[PDB]
Design a binder for this molecule. Sequence first.
Ligand SMILES: CN(C(=O)Cn1cc(Br)cn1)C1CC1
Ligand SMILES: [Cl-]
Length: 115
Amino acid sequence: KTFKQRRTFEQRVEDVRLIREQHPTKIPVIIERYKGEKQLPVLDKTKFLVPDHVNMSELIKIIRRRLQLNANQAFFLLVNGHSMVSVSTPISEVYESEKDEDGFLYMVYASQETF
Ligand SMILES: CN(C(=O)Cn1cc(Br)cn1)C1CC1
Ligand SMILES: [Cl-]
């Protein structure tokens, strides 16, 4: 069901190496609904190429637009398993400190802060 489950470490690593060659200015992000989540819908896709200059605040807005949420729905985004310390960091900076060993940046979203 989950991405890491669907693809071998060898396949996830090769996918990241190709995004580097074909989309060198993009951050390879896996965005996944929390396996618990009741309220928010699932995304149309799993794998996003994020322009490496957007900060985490703009990425939340993108995903809320993608889910077509409205003003008073709540949305929480974990990066690499934990809360974001700051939303003003450029995703290029976040990638270098929070990327997995396969080379993707893993994110999970839910409606409560208690995932
Ligand atoms: C970039 N972006 C997307 O819609 C995902 N995407 C674009 C290509 Br090209 C492939 N995937 C949003 C998250 C910032
Ligand atoms: Cl590019």
